[PDB]
Design a protein around this ligand. Structure first.
Ligand SMILES: [Zn+2]
Ligand SMILES: [Zn+2]
Ligand SMILES: [Zn+2]
Lengths: 134, 266, 65, 46, 114
């Protein structure tokens, strides 16, 4: 506990001392321009595309969205989107390489421009660890 | 009998006050330590959440579930799942609890440890029954629900020790004091004018003769007589926290004695 | 955000004490210090556990879904 | 019973294809939230 | 993230033994025992009893680093007295003390009314 360190009681930590929830909202909208050239929310496969992240897309449903409840980590594709460049081209959103958690909530709504747009909230409990500031 | 000596001052269902005389400070402390960290207990160690429409997070809830005290009376007759030959868990190594709760009323529906329900086959062991000590018989508010609110989960309670997670602590605070007069001079009192007037004396001073100023410092004297009070969280009765505390320590010394035997071959 | 089960510092269960505490303040019309002692919360680590608990779940429950 | 999306307002259990726009059938809100997996999530009670 | 499993405090790993006797270099009839998956509950308790042994020249213990659940116990004894036997007697003395305590607490608890 010298030079501004502190000794925290692990017994008290186990009981809930300084435990916190962490949330992160990932966002995406279906295209910007082109009545013919419109992006799509979908779980994408081979279809000449191959521009994938991989980062497994395996946790996504048919709508290119992870169901709230699933555990996520590393570079798991949280939102699947494709760009039609002519076959498809990847536009999928991987989770932050550093982060991991549980899909908390997934809002499927529309923008003022009649755009299909989504928000993906991911929840992580953070327990007081070593170089954590207090 | 021979070595260490006990005098129980006061005793209750959840608290023992006793004087532990004719002892080594190493022993009294090692006993204090082992009561806090190493007596095995049964606590929820796995939650499978089927439904949660509460305002509380999955893990937030699962965390508090582990903290609910569960009957640990017949614990040595339950295996550690790590030693159990089953794939995962069973009735030989784990207890399975169920929590189904729905907001039926307009008024706030409260969720208590009384509402946990043993599904497992206990095989006639006093184990897994949530510890209930409140006058209303509810014991521990796990959660609160609105109207459409629902909570459906399954608990696998397992054997463990505080040393792995504080939830497995059969005891709370252990009071500990030796030499309430500082005749031993084991502490140096910080003062302004008079340490004696500035430091409140222990209830324990009644039990010992005061130093007597006109006597030289007893250099040879050693700390033997330890004023303790052991508090139980509920899982195991107070007598058992100390008896199992002794037995665990006694057991872990025997494992060293046996280790010496095993390495004495080839 | 609900009465923590157990005092962080010591371990004494505190989850079963919240409602009893409010009644002691409401019905019995006692002060916080006598109420905390009536619940058998002798150590200050246990007193702070309940005395300083802010029950936000009541606010959270007020939300319509 | 087999929910795909739930209305954020009236708590309506519904489900519709990308060929059926957004909105909630009798509420008329554009909010919507994905329903929880049936995959069952395991937690250590630590 | 880089945290060990809390079971690593009390559970022996693969290719890991409890006691590891090692002959000391610096002094005659001295030995150094590494106690794996143990702490101040045992280190202090054994050391203090080993000092009650009149044939024990030296007895000390240390926990080199708090991350790891292990302690080193040093024992030096009178010529003719092997340290393993001093640790043997040390342990038995402890077990006997504990059994007497167990009995006495049990005899006392049975008189108590509440
Ligand atoms: Zn089993
Ligand atoms: Zn406390
Ligand atoms: Zn609606």
């Amino acid at each position: 506990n010298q030079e501004d360190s502190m000794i925290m009681n692990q017994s008290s930590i186990d009981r809930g001392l300084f435990r916190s929830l962490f949330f992160r909202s990932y966002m995406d909208q279906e295209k910007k321009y082109g009545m013919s050239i419109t992006e799509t929310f979908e779980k994408p496969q081979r279809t000449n595309t191959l521009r994938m992240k991989h980062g497994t897309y395996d946790k996504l449903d048919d709508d290119g969205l992870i169901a709230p409840g699933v555990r996520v980590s590393g570079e798991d594709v949280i939102i699947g989107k494709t760009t039609p460049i002519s076959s498809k081209r990847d536009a999928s959103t991987p989770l932050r390489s550093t982060e991991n958690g549980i899909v908390d909530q997934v809002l499927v709504t529309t923008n003022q421009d009649g755009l299909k747009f989504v928000k993906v909230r991911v929840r992580t409990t953070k327990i007081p660890q070593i170089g954590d500031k207090f | 009998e021979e070595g260490p000596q006990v005098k129980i001052r006061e005793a209750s269902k959840d608290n023992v006050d006793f004087i532990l005389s004719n002892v080594d400070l190493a022993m009294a402390n090692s006993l204090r330590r082992v009561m806090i960290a190493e007596i095995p207990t049964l606590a929820i160690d796995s939650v499978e959440v089927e439904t949660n429409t509460t305002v509380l997070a999955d893990e937030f809830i699962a965390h508090r579930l582990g903290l609910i005290p569960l009957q640990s009376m017949d614990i040595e007759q339950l295996e550690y799942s790590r030693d159990c030959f089953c794939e995962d868990h069973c009735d030989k190594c784990s207890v399975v609890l169920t929590l189904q709760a729905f907001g039926e009323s307009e008024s706030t529906t409260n969720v208590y440890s009384k509402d946990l329900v043993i599904v497992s086959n206990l095989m006639g062991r006093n184990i897994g029954h949530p510890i209930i000590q409140d006058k209303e018989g509810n014991g521990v508010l796990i959660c609160k629900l609105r109207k459409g609110q629902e909570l459906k989960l399954t608990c696998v309670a397992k054997k463990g020790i505080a040393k792995e997670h504080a939830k497995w602590g059969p005891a709370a605070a252990i009071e500990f004091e030796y030499d309430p007069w500082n005749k031993l001079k084991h502490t140096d009192y910080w003062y302004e004018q008079d340490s004696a007037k500035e430091w409140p004396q222990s209830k324990n001073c009644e039990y010992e003769d005061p130093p007597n100023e006109g006597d030289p410092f007893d250099y040879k004297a050693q700390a033997d007589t330890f004023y303790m009070n052991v508090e139980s969280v509920g899982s195991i009765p107070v007598d058992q926290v100390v008896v199992r505390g002794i037995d665990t320590l006694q057991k872990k010394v025997a494992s060293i004695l046996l280790a010496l035997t095993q390495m004495d071959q080839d | 955000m609900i009465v923590p089960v157990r005092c962080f510092s010591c371990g004494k269960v505190v989850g079963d004490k919240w409602e009893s505490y409010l009644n002691l303040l409401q019905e019995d019309e006692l002060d916080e210090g006598t109420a905390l002692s009536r619940l058998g919360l002798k150590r200050y680590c246990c007193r702070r556990m309940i005395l300083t608990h802010v029950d936000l779940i009541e606010k959270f429950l007020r939300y319509n879904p | 019973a087999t929910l795909k999306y739930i209305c954020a307002e009236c708590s309506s259990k519904l489900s519709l294809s990308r060929t059926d726009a957004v909105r909630c059938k009798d509420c008329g809100h554009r909010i919507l939230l994905k329903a929880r997996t049936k995959r069952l999530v395991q937690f250590e009670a630590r | 993230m880089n945290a060990p499993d809390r079971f690593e405090l009390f559970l022996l790993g693969e290719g890991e033994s409890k006691l590891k006797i090692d002959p000391d270099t610096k002094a005659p009839n001295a030995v150094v025992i590494t106690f794996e998956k143990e702490d101040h509950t045992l280190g202090n308790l054994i050391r203090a009893e080993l000092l009650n042994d009149r044939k024990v020249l030296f007895a000390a213990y240390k926990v080199e680093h708090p991350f790891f659940a292990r302690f080193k116990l040093r024992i030096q004894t009178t010529e003719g007295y092997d340290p393993k036997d001093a640790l043997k007697n040390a342990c038995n003395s402890i077990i006997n003390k504990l059994g007497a305590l167990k009995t006495n607490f049990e005899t006392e608890w049975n008189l108590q009314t509440l």
